[PDB]
Design a protein around this ligand. Structure first.
Ligand SMILES: [Ca+2]
Ligand SMILES: [Cs+]
Length: 241
């Protein structure tokens, strides 16, 4: 509650089991920063039992021309991971891109602008038990070894989310016999608190406090902000998509 910088974490109030998730966005990048789009079983992090369930897309500000895919299963203190690296062109902070995650009982699939960059079948996928919510966050890590020196002269930084679409898993049903049917679309003309929640917390390793001030709708785009506390409001024009 006392750090000098603020960041963001947006999360769907409801979690689901299987589905397709798409977010049209332009990311923020700078040495030290981290932003991800990820499926997440809330409570996975609580040492008291329960498996860890998570699927990530993560962009490290020091190299916006690339991102990592990952599946984390197991349980805190014995989690299995599968970090892979992928290229993005143009760099995630120079243009809008459609990032997609697909999760069925048999495979997890990652896509950018509707093109596949990874598909995992079986294995860890089998241990993605229960539900997961859809999350997006923007922060800075203290581990310079992982994210790079924290380039403070670069703040304020802003990520822009134009829209999100969430589809249900309907094996065979859906266009061209695909496995998903559109459930809902959020074009972000407003922050819909009946659908989304904003984090208000932090952790050891996070140079920033995630606060509800760092997420807000502006000109038809959702904005996630990384800035000095009190400086969360964007000035200037929203990038066009
Ligand atoms: Ca929009
Ligand atoms: Cs600046």
């Amino acid at each position: 509650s006392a750090k000098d910088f603020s960041g963001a974490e947006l999360y769907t109030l409801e979690e689901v089991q299987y589905g397709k998730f798409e977010a049209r966005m332009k990311m923020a990048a700078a040495s030290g920063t981290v932003s991800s789009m990820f499926l997440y079983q809330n409570g996975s992090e609580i040492a008291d039992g329960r498996p860890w369930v998570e699927v990530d897309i993560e962009v490290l500000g020091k190299n916006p021309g690339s991102f990592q895919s990952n599946i984390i299963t197991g349980k805190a203190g014995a989690q299995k991971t599968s970090i892979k690296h992928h290229a993005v062109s143009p760099a995630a902070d120079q243009a809008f891109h459609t990032y997609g995650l697909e999760w069925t009982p048999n495979y997890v699939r990652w896509t950018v602008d509707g093109q596949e960059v990874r598909k995992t079948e079986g294995g860890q996928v089998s241990n993605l038990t229960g539900t997961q919510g859809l999350r997006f966050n923007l922060w800075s890590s203290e581990s310079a070894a992982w994210v790079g020196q924290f380039d403070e002269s670069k703040l304020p930084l802003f990520q822009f989310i134009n829209w999100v679409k969430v589809y249900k898993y309907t094996p065979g049903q859906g266009e061209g016999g695909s496995d998903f049917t559109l459930d809902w679309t959020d074009n972000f003309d407003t922050f819909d608190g009946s659908r989304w929640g904003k984090g208000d917390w932090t952790f050891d390793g996070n140079r920033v406090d995630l606060t509800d001030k760092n997420i807000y709708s502006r000109d038809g785009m959702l904005i996630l902000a990384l800035t000095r506390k009190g400086q969360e409001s964007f000035n200037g024009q929203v990038p066009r998509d």
